[PDB]
């Protein structure tokens, strides 16, 4: 994949299957793709803090990894579909030579500069904080110097005490209150890329909480399946239970719900408007050359989360791991079908035309994706997999020793 | 990287009329046996630039597409460098003995010497050559065209007297009834654009009518209000119709009852408008077009006049057959020509070699060493214009200079320096053509004609007399060839013949009917189609693909060739065919690309017999258009009628779009959250398209890709849909014949169930419909959608109410291409300056001196867009400004070439706050109207509508 | 490092040097090694004429006879005429003075005479401004020939006050 | 290093040589160019040795009096029979002002519209023994140039529209940049 992007870099975007009139294309889907998934981490470990959901203990840990290996991969595409790269760093509101030559503050790309480079920041600190407790656990060890070092340098002076636990609890409750609004707000600043133009499919204004929602649903659906093969490639299934896949499968389903309202809404304003423009765009999709890609993006996205309702396939670790796998192919076409059949067909009939992609728009994205399991792999194998202070606090109050014992 | 060192060389000697930075024009004229022009030539400190047009009182001749784009092969570094004897380099003295050794000789012997040449329309040019036949016993001069036009100088000649044709006034009739006339076109070197366009301005309840009858489909068909397909063995019974209505006269003409039923009319409305109607007929048959004269005399109309004919096409389809009988019957000696190519553009050049082999010292005077060239005994290094001297008389009544304007790049020679050598006369052209310059010029001699460029002569109309045309009429009737299929020869606007073979603006140049670049195709109807089971269509990457097919004649056949289903193209049972593409000497593979057909052009003729069978593979094209039709939306060209336009409101025909209030509608241009910026003062510009005077907008393009340095683009990376173009013009078909039956089918519409199936047959036009054309560029809004979004802030509004764009914030975030909803936005994708993938004139160091320095060349990454004319309305403005005076009325219009440079008057450029301009009076109309004005973007070019009845 | 004898180093010089081909530059491929090659004789082009009268000896005292000023009142009484005086003469003739000037003080080359003693017409300075007497060079290349006519007018009005 | 030793000291400093007689174009043309060989010999056909109270502690006279021969070999002058040869060589300068060539900068309506002085752009030219770039002309010195100073409406028509106006309304003289406009990225590099 490193090697397509120099390619590319080093002798021009006319190499990826852009053309003229779809300026967009696989470069931004696979953006808003990798952004969608890295959602799922910070609404695990501060959406389910803020409702006290106990279940989420054992989760929290891998949840956060998912985040800051997936934030990276689309922080890649911002810069390799640039035209003139080198001179990325202008973006920045940076005195200089040229009579103090500002940016402007009303482009979304420029907020969305600011939403992704804050959000990935304020989570880094936020997931490191909570692993001085469990770095701890691992210096204590020190089976070799070498671990000894390194362990030593990864905790900082964590001796757990009354004190430290009070503030840690109380910047954690912080810092939850914080990241709800960061998921929010930065997938909203992705959404008014679309949201505020004037190309008719494009300009609404159900996208700030549309794809918000979006977002969650294809974020849980992907973690969701690395838990699934977590629990027995780790031999931790007694940390992670049928409860906790159960409640995920019961999460997706329910914003499964919300993303079919909103298509309907979408159809029904469409109808009663008296815009022929923004009718026909939804006939496009419904017929014509992509029809496949739209027909097979609602059958995922309609169907898979209604299965849910029955407990004999939401209670199966079998059939739920397979519609994870489906829910992210869907959400993929999700992104690819709003831009592209938006831009093929609009104002002015001369101007229309079609979109293939290359093997290098295809190569890239393969890249993308193995970095993040070279990441993720790399991590499981480095990183304590679930937090010790969270556990240790649950393990009386939950379990199925000191239930039997209150019984009885 | 420490960056170059950079030197500057002054003049040792310099010349007074040169100073640096400051550019020359010159006045001269062109005429290269095809296409003609009166023109100026912009010089920089030592070397021609950009083509403008010469106006001084003599404005009848402004440049086509074909001439504006000729400046490469002045630059082209494929020219014949240095004259070549027996296939050797050698010296022009080694020319001049072996050329008057063998002239003695044949002298001598008693041979026969043969100049060839092309309509060399020259009082000095012709009377030097009379010079070489008064000392030459036994030399004959002729004439030989590639796409011929004796029979209507046979017509002409046999009633007037004289080989000229006559310049029909377009501007001064009513009905114009056209039997295959192609006036827009190539037809007799068609220079009738704005005399047609000027009478298509309803100013009052006035507009002139156009009756067009043709086979195939053409700019004056599409330009036409009604349209009759109809094959040639129709249209010579037509013109006898036509005849006996205008004239009284019984002639028993078999014809179609459903044609009859509008040829009739038609005739019946001509001969109803005495004065005031114009009978125009290119069917290659003198009898035809000796009907015709007969007719335009009975009519008497003003468009119809003997007082000055036209002097540009004086050939002969008897004489030159004559010719090569006789090289190949008897013995010729020294044959000399110069700007003649058998080889490729005769039928029979077969038969010509054959007859080259039996001939000594062939002399062959051109540019590029071609098929000619090759079977030859001389190659000349030949001149290319603007490094010789001349004069041409295009009409009976003018005489006009050519001047050279840059020193000879190559060792050349001017044909008539070496006749003035080899009939033994001193000095050279130049000096002949001052000697002989007072025969003419009665005025002051250069300093007031080669300063002007033009000289005014009288002239007087030609007398007439008897002839029997119901004779002629009565042979028209009888003759029919009334067989199977048949095909149809053309030229094109961008390639007329092979004189621009390798020219790169003409190969990228795409057709204005067809809207396809890069290739050669045959035409055919889809109601043949269906027959020969041919056909194109539309792939996943957005270009087209085609099915291949054989033509087969009389003893001869292609073999392949590729189809283009254009749906009204042909009438039925006839095929297009453009003829002049297959070259293949002295050009690059890149070039070398399209197909001759001139094989095809038997006896000279036009109209061929054919068999079509269909081919086995599949061909893909650089197609530049996608979708043929619109889709009703009446939005985009509001077209109606002359007796609506006349009676009704505007209300009912220029309507704007409403908006509501407090339950209360008001015009939609009034709703606006924001606040407006000041442009009251200070030079507001707009820019002004109407739709009627849009024939084809042909020549407006290339002028435009001229200054602004637009590279070019192969046949991929067009393939792709990916081509570099600032302003475009567009092509709209109908279905069900009419635009107003593609708005009732629209409009009447039910529930889901039906709406699937419309808006899937609304995209394949149907037979016979109507054309419309609509050019699009960038017009600099006011709440521009592709501002607001950039991020690094590249674009900016001025004062003046452009939009500014630099080239240096420009990193390539492809936004602004998106939020256009006209969509008009150029990002460039690979490097086109100097990489070997691109091996243009952009490439190769002699062939970069046709770019100017006050436009940079883009490299990587940044986006341009057709911008008005910053570059010199900022030096309109500085030429104003140090003087002392304030800009005049028609100074900001001459300067900007997107409208200083198209041939009717449609486009217009100007300023608005000057209430006495051009624009200003434009602006205050009934037919004001913008695109899309319920987007809500206020541009700055608005169109009109179109009046068609 | 930056140095002065040499130019400064560049960050990826995209639109730096130039494809097209500005004036003065040098190139390889013109007929010398400059970029400024000459127009070919006997042309004209639109807003100039060329002058009818030969070199000194005998179009000289023809052109003193018989060639006038083919200005206006208008243009005469704007101030431009004493202008192009003020730069192109005073380095030999005096600015108020005749023959003072900057340079026979300095006496870096003598022989430059006043205004009283040779008797000079309106059209015996426009010849010799484009030419020169034997001392003077070619000013053409300088002035236009618009501007010629407004120093004549000038000179005349200097001897008039001497 | 030039290939002849050019004094702008000598010439524009102690001979009070005009600062527009051999840079001739700035009043028409956007490129004040270099001088032709022409305008050195009009002057210099009776100059051949130079002074003698000229040459100084690091130039002598030998030194000028061997290279003022060189400006009579690019042209082709004989100092003997005093006549022309027919032999020319032109003088390969070196250009030390440059800008990249997306700017359009224009002398013409810089000098002779606004009337700026020749040594406030170049620095004091006439106190050079050799030529030295002044001024950095990096993007933000035409920007601040332009903040405060004033256009010339005094006796231009060009601006009777407008400085007859607003005076009535709004002011009595307005600045360059920001009130006409010059600040704009479609007029500075298009
Ligand atoms: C130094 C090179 C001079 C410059 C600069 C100008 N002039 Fe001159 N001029 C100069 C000399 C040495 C002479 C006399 C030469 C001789 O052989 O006698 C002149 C002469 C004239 C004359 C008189 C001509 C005549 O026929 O008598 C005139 C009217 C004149 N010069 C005008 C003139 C103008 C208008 C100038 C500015 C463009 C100018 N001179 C400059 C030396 C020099
Ligand atoms: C002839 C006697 C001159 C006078 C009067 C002025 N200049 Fe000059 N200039 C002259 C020459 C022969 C050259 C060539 C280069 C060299 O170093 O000799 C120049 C050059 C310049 C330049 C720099 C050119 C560049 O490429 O950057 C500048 C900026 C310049 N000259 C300015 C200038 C000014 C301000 C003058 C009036 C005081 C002036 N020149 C007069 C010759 C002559
Ligand atoms: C081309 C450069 C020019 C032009 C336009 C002029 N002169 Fe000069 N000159 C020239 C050279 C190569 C030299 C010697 C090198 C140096 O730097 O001095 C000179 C020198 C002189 C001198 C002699 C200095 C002395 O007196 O010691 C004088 C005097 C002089 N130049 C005068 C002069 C005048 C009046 C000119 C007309 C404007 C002029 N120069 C132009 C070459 C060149
Ligand atoms: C006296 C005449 C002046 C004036 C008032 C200015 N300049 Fe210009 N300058 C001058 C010369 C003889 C040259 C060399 C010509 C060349 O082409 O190199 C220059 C050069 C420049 C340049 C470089 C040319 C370019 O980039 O195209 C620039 C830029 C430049 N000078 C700028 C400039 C400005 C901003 C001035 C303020 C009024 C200015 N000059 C004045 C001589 C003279
Ligand atoms: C960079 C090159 C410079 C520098 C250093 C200066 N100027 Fe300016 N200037 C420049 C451009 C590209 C333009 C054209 C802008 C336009 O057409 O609006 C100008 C223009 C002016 C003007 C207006 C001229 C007019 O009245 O039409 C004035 C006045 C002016 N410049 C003045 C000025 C002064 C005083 C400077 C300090 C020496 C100066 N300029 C520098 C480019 C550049
Ligand atoms: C809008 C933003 C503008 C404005 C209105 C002007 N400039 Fe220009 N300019 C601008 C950029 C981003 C750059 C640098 C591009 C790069 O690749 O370096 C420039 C560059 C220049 C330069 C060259 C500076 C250098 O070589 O370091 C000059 C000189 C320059 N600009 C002059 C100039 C003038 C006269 C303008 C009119 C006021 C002007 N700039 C406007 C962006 C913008
Ligand atoms: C040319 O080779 C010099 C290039 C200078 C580059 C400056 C880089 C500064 C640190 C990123
Ligand atoms: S038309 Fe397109 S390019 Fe021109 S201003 Fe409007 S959006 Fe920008
Ligand atoms: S939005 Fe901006 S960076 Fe270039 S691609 Fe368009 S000008």
Same mark, same amino acid.
């Given at each position: ?12 975007? /006319? ?26 981490? !910070? ?89 001085? #407790? ?69 300009? &609404? ?204 | ?27 001269? !004229? ?278 000055? !004919? ?94 050279? !304007? ?143 097919? &054989? ?129 009251? &003062? ?268 | ?5 040499? #130019? ?155 | ?74 042209? /082709?002058?004989?100092? &003997? ?110």
């Amino acid at each position: 994949g490193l090697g397509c992007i120099i390619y590319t870099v080093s002798t021009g975007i /006319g190499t990826w299957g852009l053309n003229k009139t779809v300026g967009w294309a696989w470069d931004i889907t696979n953006f808003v793709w990798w952004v969608g998934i890295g959602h799922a981490g !910070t609404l695990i470990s501060a959406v389910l803090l803020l409702f006290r959901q106990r279940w989420r203990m054992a989760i929290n840990r891998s949840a956060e990894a998912m985040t800051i290996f997936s934030v990276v991969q689309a922080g890649l595409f911002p810069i390799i579909h640039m035209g003139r790269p080198w001179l990325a760093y202008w973006v920045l509101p940076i005195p200089n030579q040229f009579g103090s030559l500002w940016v402007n503050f009303n482009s979304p790309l420029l907020w969305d500069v600011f939403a992704i480079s804050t959000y990935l920041s304020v989570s880094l600190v936020f997931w490191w904080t909570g692993l001085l #407790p469990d770095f701890a656990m691992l210096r204590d060890r020190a089976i070799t110097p070498f671990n000894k070092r390194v362990y030593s340098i990864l905790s900082f002076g964590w001796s757990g005490r009354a004190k430290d636990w009070q503030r840690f609890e109380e910047v954690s409750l912080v810092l939850a209150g914080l990241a709800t609004p960061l998921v929010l707000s930065v997938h909203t600043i992705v959404s008014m890329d679309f949201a505020t133009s004037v190309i008719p499919g494009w300009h &609404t204004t159900i996208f700030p909480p549309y794809f918000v929602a979006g977002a969650v649903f294809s974020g849980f659906a992907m973690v969701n399946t690395l838990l699934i093969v977590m629990r027995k490639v780790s031999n931790l299934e007694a940390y992670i239970t049928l409860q906790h896949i159960e409640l995920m499968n019961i999460i997706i389903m329910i914003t499964g719900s919300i993303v079919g309202v909103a298509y309907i809404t979408e159809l029904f304003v469409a109808w009663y408007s008296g815009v022929e423009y923004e009718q026909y765009a939804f006939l496009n999709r419904a017929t014509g050359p992509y029809w496949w890609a739209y027909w097979s993006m609602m059958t995922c996205n309609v169907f898979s989360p209604q299965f849910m309702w029955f407990k004999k396939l939401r209670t199966s670790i079998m059939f739920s791991f397979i519609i994870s796998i489906v829910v992210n192919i869907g959400m993929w076409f999700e992104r690819f079908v709003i831009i592209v059949t938006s831009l093929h067909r609009d104002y002015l009939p001369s101007s229309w035309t079609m979109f293939s992609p290359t093997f290098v728009d295809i190569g890239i994205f393969i890249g993308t994706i193995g970095f993040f399991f070279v990441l993720f792999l790399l991590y499981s194998r480095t990183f304590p997999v679930i937090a010790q202070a969270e556990v240790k606090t649950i393990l009386k109050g939950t379990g199925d020793n000191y239930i039997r014992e209150r019984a009885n | 990287c420490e960056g170059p060192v950079h030197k500057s060389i002054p003049y040792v000697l310099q010349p007074e009329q040169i100073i640096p930075g400051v550019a020359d024009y010159y006045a001269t !004229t062109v005429f290269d046996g095809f296409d003609f022009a009166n023109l100026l030539v912009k010089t920089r400190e030592g070397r021609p630039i950009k083509i403008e047009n010469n106006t001084i009182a003599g404005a009848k001749f402004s440049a086509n597409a074909r001439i504006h784009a000729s400046i490469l092969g002045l630059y082209d570094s494929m020219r014949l460098k240095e004259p070549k004897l027996d296939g050797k380099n050698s010296s022009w003295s080694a020319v001049d003995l072996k050329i008057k050794s063998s002239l003695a000789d044949a002298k001598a012997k008693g041979g026969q010497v043969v100049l060839l040449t092309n309509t060399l329309a020259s009082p000095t040019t012709e009377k030097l050559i009379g010079e070489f036949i008064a000392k030459n016993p036994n030399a004959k001069h002729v004439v030989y065209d590639a796409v011929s036009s004796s029979d209507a100088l046979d017509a002409f000649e046999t009633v007037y007297g004289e080989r000229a044709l006559v310049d029909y006034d377009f501007s001064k009739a009513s009905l114009i009834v056209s039997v295959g006339a192609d006036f827009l076109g190539d037809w007799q070197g068609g220079g009738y654009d704005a005399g047609y366009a000027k009478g298509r301005i309803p100013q009052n309840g006035k507009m002139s009518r156009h009756f067009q009858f043709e086979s195939n489909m053409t700019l004056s068909g599409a330009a036409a209000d009604k349209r009759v397909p109809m094959t040639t063995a129709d249209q010579k019974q037509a013109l006898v119709q036509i005849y006996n209505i205008v004239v009284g006269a019984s002639v028993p003409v078999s014809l179609d009852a459903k044609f009859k039923a509008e040829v009739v009319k038609a005739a019946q409305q001509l001969k109803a408008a005495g004065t005031k109607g114009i009978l125009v007929s290119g069917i290659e048959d003198k009898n035809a077009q000796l009907l015709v004269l007969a007719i335009n005399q009975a009519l008497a109309s003003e468009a119809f006049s003997t007082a000055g !004919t036209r002097q540009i096409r004086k050939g002969s389809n008897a004489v030159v057959a004559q010719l090569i009988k006789d090289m190949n019957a008897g013995s010729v000696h020294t044959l000399i020509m110069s700007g003649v190519n058998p080889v490729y553009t005769l039928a029979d050049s077969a038969s010509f070699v054959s007859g080259l082999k039996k001939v000594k010292t062939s002399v062959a005077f051109s540019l590029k060493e071609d098929e000619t060239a090759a079977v030859s005994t001389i190659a000349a290094a030949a001149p290319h214009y603007l490094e010789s001297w001349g004069d041409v008389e295009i009409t009976k009544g003018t005489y006009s200079l050519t001047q050279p !304007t840059i020193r000879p790049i190559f060792d050349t020679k001017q044909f008539q320096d070496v006749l003035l050598s080899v009939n033994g006369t001193p000095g050279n052209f130049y000096d002949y053509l001052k000697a002989n310059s007072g025969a003419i010029i009665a005025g002051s001699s250069w300093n007031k004609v080669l300063h002007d460029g033009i000289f005014v002569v009288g002239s007087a109309a030609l007398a007439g007399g008897s002839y029997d045309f119901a004779g002629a009429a009565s042979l028209l009737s009888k003759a029919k060839s009334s067989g199977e299929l048949e095909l149809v020869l053309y030229t094109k606007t961008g390639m007329g013949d092979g004189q621009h073979a390798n020219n790169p603006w003409l190969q990228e140049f795409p057709d204005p009917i067809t809207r396809v670049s890069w290739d050669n195709y045959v035409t055919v109807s889809n109601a043949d189609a269906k027959k020969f089971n041919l056909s194109n269509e539309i792939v996943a990457n957005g270009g087209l693909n085609g099915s291949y097919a &054989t033509i087969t004649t009389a003893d001869g056949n292609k073999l392949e060739n590729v189809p283009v289903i254009v749906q009204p193209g042909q009438a039925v049972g006839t095929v297009g065919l453009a003829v002049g593409y297959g070259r293949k000497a002295a050009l690059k593979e890149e070039m070398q690309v399209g197909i001759n057909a001139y094989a095809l052009y038997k006896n000279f003729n036009s109209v061929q017999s054919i068999t079509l069978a269909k081919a086995n593979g599949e061909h893909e094209f650089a197609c530049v258009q996608g979708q043929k039709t619109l889709m009703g939306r009446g939005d985009i060209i509001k077209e109606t009628t002359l007796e609506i336009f006349n009676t009704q409101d505007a209300k009912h025909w220029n309507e704007q779009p409403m908006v509501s209030l407090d339950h209360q509608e008001v015009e939609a241009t009034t709703v606006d959250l924001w606040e407006s910026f000041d442009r009251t &003062t200070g030079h507001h510009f707009n820019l002004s398209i109407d739709l009627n005077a849009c024939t084809g907008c042909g020549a407006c393009v290339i002028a435009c890709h001229a200054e602004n340095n637009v590279p070019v683009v192969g046949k991929a990376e067009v393939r792709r849909s990916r081509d570099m173009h600032w302003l475009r013009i567009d092509r709209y078909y109908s279905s069900e014949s009419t635009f107003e039956g593609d708005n009732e089918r629209k409009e009447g519409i039910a529930g889901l169930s039906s709406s699937l199936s419309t808006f899937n047959e609304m995209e394949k036009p149907g037979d016979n419909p109507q054309v419309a054309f609509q050019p699009v560029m960038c017009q600099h809004c006011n709440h521009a959608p592709c501002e607001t979004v950039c991020p690094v802030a590249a674009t900016s509004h001025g004062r003046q109410g452009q939009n500014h764009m630099a080239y240096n914030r420009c990193v390539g975030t492809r936004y602004c291409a998106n939020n256009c909803p006209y969509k008009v936005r150029r990002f460039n994708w690979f490097l086109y300056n100097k990489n070997s993938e691109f091996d243009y004139h952009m490439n190769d160091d002699l062939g970069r001196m046709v770019l100017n320095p006050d436009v940079n060349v883009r490299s990587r990454g940044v986006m341009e867009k057709c911008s008005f004319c910053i570059q010199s309305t900022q030096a309109v403005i500085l030429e104003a400004k140090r003087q002392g005076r304030v800009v005049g009325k028609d100074e900001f219009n001459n300067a900007c070439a997107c409208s200083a440079a198209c041939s009717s008057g449609a486009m217009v450029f100007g300023d608005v706050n000057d209430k006495e301009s051009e624009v200003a009076k434009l602006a205050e109309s009934e037919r004001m109207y913008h695109l899309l004005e319920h987007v809500g973007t206020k541009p700055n070019v608005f169109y009109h509508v179109k009046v068609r009845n | 490092c930056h140095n002065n004898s040499a #130019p400064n180093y560049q960050y990826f010089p995209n639109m730096y040097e130039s494809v097209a081909y500005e004036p003065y530059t040098e190139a390889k491929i013109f007929k010398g090694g400059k970029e400024g090659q000459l127009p070919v004789e006997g042309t004209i082009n639109r807003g100039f004429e060329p002058y009818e009268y030969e070199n000194s000896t005998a179009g000289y005292e023809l052109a003193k006879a018989n060639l006038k000023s083919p200005l206006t009142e208008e243009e005469k009484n704007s101030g431009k005429g004493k202008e192009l005086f003020e730069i192109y003469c005073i380095s030999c003739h005096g600015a108020a003075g005749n023959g003072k000037g900057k340079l026979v003080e300095r006496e870096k080359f003598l022989g430059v005479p006043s205004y009283k003693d040779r008797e000079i017409t309106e059209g015996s300075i426009f010849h010799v401004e484009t030419y020169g007497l034997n001392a003077m060079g070619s000013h053409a290349n300088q002035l236009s020939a618009h501007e010629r006519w407004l120093v004549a007018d000038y000179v005349l009005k200097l001897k008039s006050q001497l | 290093i030039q290939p002849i030793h050019y004094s702008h000291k000598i010439h524009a400093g102690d001979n009070e040589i005009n600062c527009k007689y051999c840079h001739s174009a700035a009043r028409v043309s956007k490129t004040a160019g270099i001088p032709s060989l022409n305008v050195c010999m009009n002057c210099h056909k009776n100059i051949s040795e130079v002074a003698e109270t000229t040459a100084t502690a690091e130039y002598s006279k030998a030194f000028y009096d061997a290279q003022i021969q060189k400006l009579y070999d690019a042209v /082709g002058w004989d100092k &003997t029979k005093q006549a022309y040869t027919g032999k020319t060589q032109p003088v390969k300068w070196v250009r030390i002002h440059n800008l990249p060539d997306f700017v359009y900068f224009n002398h013409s309506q810089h000098v002779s519209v606004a009337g700026v002085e020749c040594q406030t752009c170049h620095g004091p030219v006439q106190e050079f023994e050799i030529m030295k770039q002044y001024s950095k002309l990096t993007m933000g010195w035409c920007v601040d140039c332009h903040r405060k100073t004033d256009v010339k409406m005094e006796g231009n028509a060009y601006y009777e529209k407008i400085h007859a106006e607003l005076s009535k309304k709004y002011g009595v003289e307005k600045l360059t940049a920001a009130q006409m406009g010059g600040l704009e990225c479609g007029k500075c590099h298009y």
